[PDB]
Amino acid sequence: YLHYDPETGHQLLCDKCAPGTYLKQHCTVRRKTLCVPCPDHSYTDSWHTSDECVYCSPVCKELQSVKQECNRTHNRVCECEEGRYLEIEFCLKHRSCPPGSGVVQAGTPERNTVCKKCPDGFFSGETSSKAPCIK
């Protein structure tokens, strides 16, 4: 139900291709926009005009799992193991607060743990990425 517009004999508007398909032939005065389902190992996740589907990539890394497999409507979704997060190319372990520091924010599989010094009256003194400051 979304519209763009090409031209040859006379400029006119016509429907975009829905997700899961790619544009194979523009809309003619006689025909509606021709859309064909994405070939295997490809996808489209919005209304578009591209004449080619988007390749499913990248491959899941070593310590990653496939959360959501590849579909014609969505890309592959990879997630790191528990206790790790994606840093550039590898799933590194979450930071470990040194003696005198305690984690304040947990570590998402997409973000590292945030540490911070304890307030007055606290003395953690522990090398742990899974323990706050103790009174």
């Binding site: 919005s46 578009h48 591209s50 004449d51 988007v54 990539s57 990248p58 840093e87 550039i88």
Partner: protein, 154 residues
């Protein structure tokens, strides 16, 4: 035919560790040059369809300060990214680099990455460079650059 050879703009180089888009290059000084392509804050925009050859050379360097850590496991990576126009989508064309241990034992460290490829581009598509540890980048024009030149029509 369209071409481009963009050298790193020293003045503008982020000081981080995680991936960042290098958003500043020279296009009209030294070896830096551009023809029938447009540049805008690190995004090289294609004006003319065709099969382009794309390349990128990136150099990292660092000096260990007196009393340095026993180890510094770095990821020195480059990513050449393409952004589609007919559909919002960004994907890696090429990627290179290596892990490195730039500890304090050795005073100085150097390392360069080179990637090259042959890709089909459309007018409107944008090319951009992404790297880790951008603060370690060598600012020389002969060190950190990326370019593109059309080879065939589609």
């Amino acid at each position: 035919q369209p071409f481009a050879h963009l050298t790193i703009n020293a003045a503008s180089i982020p000081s981080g560790s995680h991936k960042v888009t290098l958003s500043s290059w020279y296009h009209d000084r030294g070896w830096a040059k551009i023809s029938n392509m447009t540049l805008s804050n690190g995004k090289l925009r294609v004006n003319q369809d065709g099969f382009y050859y794309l390349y990128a050379n990136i150099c990292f360097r660092h000096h260990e300060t007196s009393g340095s850590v026993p180890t510094d496991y770095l990821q020195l990576m480059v990513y050449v990214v393409k952004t589609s126009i007919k559909i919002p989508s960004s994907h890696n064309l090429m990627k290179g680099g290596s892990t490195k241990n730039w500890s304090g034992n050795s005073e100085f460290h150097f390392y360069s990455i080179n990637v090259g490829g042959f890709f089909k581009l459309r007018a409107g598509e944008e090319i951009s460079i992404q790297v880790s540890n951008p603060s370690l980048l060598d600012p020389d024009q002969d060190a950190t650059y990326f370019g593109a030149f059309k080879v065939q029509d589609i």
